[PDB]
Design a protein around this ligand. Structure first.
Ligand code: CED
Length: 257
């Protein structure tokens, strides 16, 4: 459970921010250090869009052409020359971490500039989106591009989703995708007590074993979630991450609640 110890064990860097939204209790570790957020940013973009389009209006369709397609888009590559609903874009983004879906969501919101405008409004002067996928995944310790600190990122997740302006239907739609997202099973989901519910979105940048998971964690018996942000990376560009590191970090942090 000592986070200093797990860093030793895994020869890795750990960034943690956790907020029990009922009590307001926080757990912090390297919470002001920058990390590539990678695909965990898809949760933020999806929520921003859901602030803008009511659930009954998610049936709106967007046209997809060959220029929209970027790598690791298992769902969207099938839509070239076809239309897709905003509902299906978000499902593709959240469940399959589809990059083309996330890019389209950012475009629908109005561009990177508009995401930045919303983050500043939520009081986040830290989270720094500069590029679209997949380029945002090329992390470099020397650059702040597409990085955030566990604390800044968690505060924004809390304001946007936990204590924010989404309707009951849009919040349920988005948290249900995160709850049912099986791609996040080896991460926070793996380290919390088995009777906990975990709604997560993972991330992995291409470099420095940048491996992350953010989630809304519900202790059995509590309906208010604990917002949990875990960002990790290692010293070498080509290092492979070990998901167990995130699992063990979550197990340790959750003992604090
Ligand atoms: C978000 O992190 C996305 N990552 C990338 O596009 C960079 C990589 C491609 C292959 C390996 S890294 C998507 N999300 C995830 C994830 O959330 O775990 C993975 C593994 C790749 S696509």
């Amino acid at each position: 459970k000592e986070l200093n110890d797990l860093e030793k064990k895994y020869n890795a860097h750990i960034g943690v921010y956790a907020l029990d939204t009922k009590s307001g209790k926080e757990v912090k570790f390297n919470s002001d250090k920058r990390f590539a957020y990678a695909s965990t940013s898809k949760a933020i973009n999806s929520a921003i869009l859901l602030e803008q389009v009511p659930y009954n209006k998610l049936n709106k369709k967007v046209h997809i052409n060959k220029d929209d397609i970027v790598a690791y888009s298992p769902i969207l590559e099938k839509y070239v020359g076809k239309d897709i609903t905003l509902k299906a874009l978000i499902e593709a983004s959240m469940t399959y971490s589809d990059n083309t879906a996330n890019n389209k969501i950012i475009k629908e919101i109005g561009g990177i500039k508009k995401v930045k405008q919303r983050l500043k409004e939520l009081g986040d002067k830290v989270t720094n989106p500069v590029r679209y996928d997949i380029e945002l995944q090329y992390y470099s310790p020397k650059s702040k591009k597409d990085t955030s600190t566990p604390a800044a990122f968690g505060k924004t997740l809390n304001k946007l989703i936990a204590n924010g302006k989404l309707s009951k239907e849009n919040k349920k739609f988005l948290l249900d995708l995160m709850l049912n997202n099986k791609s996040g099973d080896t991460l926070i989901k793996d380290g919390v007590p088995k009777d906990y519910k975990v709604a997560d979105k993972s991330g992995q940048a291409i470099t420095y074993a940048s491996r992350n998971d953010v989630a809304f964690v519900y202790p059995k018996g509590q309906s208010e979630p604990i917002v949990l942000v875990i960002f990790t990376n290692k010293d070498n560009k080509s290092d492979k991450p070990n998901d167990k590191l995130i699992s063990e970090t979550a197990k340790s942090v959750m003992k604090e609640f």
